[PDB]
Design a binder for this molecule. Structure first.
Ligand SMILES: O=C(O)CCCC[C@@H]1SC[C@@H]2NC(=O)N[C@@H]21
Ligand code: NI
Length: 129
């Protein structure tokens, strides 16, 4: 099913997901995403560093803008020994969204690697749900 036939201004700022988490991101001119993430759930307290990338020249045919970012869940307060990656697309307009699927991998022994990774889906909006 996979194949092949500003974003910057739209992405930069604060976003909120359906769990009550807060994303604070700056999109750089050459594809960088940098900022912080605060999770409303899980083994998390305060803000965590986030870094990622986005397509800085997306298609102009009504398609979304591909992007992704990572948070390692270690900061000055807690270390969950886990990291999450969100993969998705930014959809602009009056009801802008970042629609993502997210993998959360915990450090495990080899015996437990089969249960290392969660998959979920987060939808981000510019106003709090
Ligand atoms: O408990 C952990 O291992 C660290 C916190 C994980 C929180 C996850 S990341 C995917 C989902 N979306 C969120 O905003 N919070 C949870
Ligand atoms: Ni956890």
């Amino acid at each position: 099913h996979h194949h092949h036939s500003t974003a910057e201004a739209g992405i930069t700022g604060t976003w909120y997901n359906q769990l009550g988490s807060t994303l604070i991101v700056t999109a750089g001119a050459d594809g960088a995403l940098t900022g912080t993430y605060e999770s409303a759930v899980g083994n998390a307290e305060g803000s965590y560093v986030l870094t990622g990338r986005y397509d800085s020249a997306p298609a102009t045919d009504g398609s979304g803008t591909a992007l992704g970012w990572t948070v390692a869940w270690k900061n000055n307060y807690r270390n969950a020994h886990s990291a999450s990656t969100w993969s998705g697309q930014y959809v602009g307009g009056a009801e802008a969204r970042i629609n993502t699927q997210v993998l959360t991998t915990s450090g495990t022994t080899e015996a437990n690697a089969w249960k290392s990774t969660l998959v979920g889906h987060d939808t981000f909006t510019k106003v709090k749900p």
